[PDB]
Write a protein that binds this ligand. Structure first.
Ligand SMILES: Cn1c(=O)c2c(c3cc(Nc4ccnc(F)c4Cl)ccc31)N[C@@H](C1CC1)C(F)(F)CO2
Ligand SMILES: Cn1c(=O)c2c(c3cc(Nc4ccnc(F)c4Cl)ccc31)N[C@@H](C1CC1)C(F)(F)CO2
Ligand SMILES: [Cl-]
Ligand SMILES: [Cl-]
Ligand SMILES: [Cl-]
Ligand SMILES: [Cl-]
Lengths: 130, 130
């Protein structure tokens, strides 16, 4: 349940993962979602704070004084909606569903969103298949 | 960095804790905070989604159609501000700074906020000192 942290303070082991699980439950039920991300013909509802916490691109967008208040954000029309959906799921769960058929689109999308460890992981998996 | 999850899917070990760390950085910089919690003479800015993810009381409050849009939430005047501050810090970090001088107020506050594992932990630490 808990342990003594390096700073001699009590820390709860599953707290962060349980908070992320609850944030994903709010997303699934469309509770307190405050933005819609438009990717081509697709729309994805989400929480701006989670998007900012999980992306250099969203962090830059929502810290801009003009943009921070937009309810709709349109992504570059070159972005693959399935690649975005996989990454949005990863943001809210820590699980990255990489497959042979989606890895190029996921990698291109992670580069655009500035999710650097995800890009590096995609590169390693591609390199192993070559 | 990552591992094979029980569902044969790639999982990133530090993802949840790193997201929580970024949410705490947004709180420290007052970025996208959407509510002020008033406890006696004290005010605490926060994100409603994090409060809901970390409290049965806030989950009930912000799922109410009338309340979900309030920018200010006043707590019961009996609530100790330091006890609330300690729990708000715990929500955003997983670290619970329990001390002999604050444990009764932290426990009373965790009961009011419906943070049940925190209450149980407080009870065990009190029991060990008796
Ligand atoms: C460049 N970059 C990533 O490469 C990145 C991010 C990432 C998040 C911010 N946001 C920050 C940064 C600082 N302070 C804040 F307050 C925020 Cl919100 C800025 C750049 C980022 N987030 C991780 C999340 C934490 C585990 C990710 F999902 F794995 C994708 O990787
Ligand atoms: C009764 N109760 C706690 O006792 C509790 C909560 C807690 C959170 C919700 N919120 C929920 C529930 C279901 N689905 C949602 F979508 C939400 Cl947001 C509802 C009741 C809760 N949250 C944890 C966080 C996860 C690690 C806590 F901070 F440790 C304090 O303990
Ligand atoms: Cl808008
Ligand atoms: Cl736009
Ligand atoms: Cl209000
Ligand atoms: Cl109120």
């Amino acid at each position: 349940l808990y342990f003594q942290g390096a700073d001699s303070c009590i820390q709860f082991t599953r707290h962060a993962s349980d908070v992320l699980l609850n944030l994903n439950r709010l997303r699934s039920r469309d509770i307190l979602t405050d933005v819609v991300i438009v990717v081509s013909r697709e729309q994805f509802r989400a929480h701006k704070t989670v998007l900012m916490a999980c992306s250099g691109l969203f962090y830059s967008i929502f810290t801009d004084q003009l943009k921070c208040n937009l309810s709709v954000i349109n992504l570059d029309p070159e972005i693959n909606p399935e690649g975005f959906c996989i990454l949005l799921d990863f943001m809210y769960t820590s699980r990255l569903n990489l497959r042979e058929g989606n890895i190029m689109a996921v990698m291109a999308t992670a580069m655009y969103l500035q999710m650097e460890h995800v890009v590096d992981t995609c590169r390693k998996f591609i390199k192993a298949s070559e």
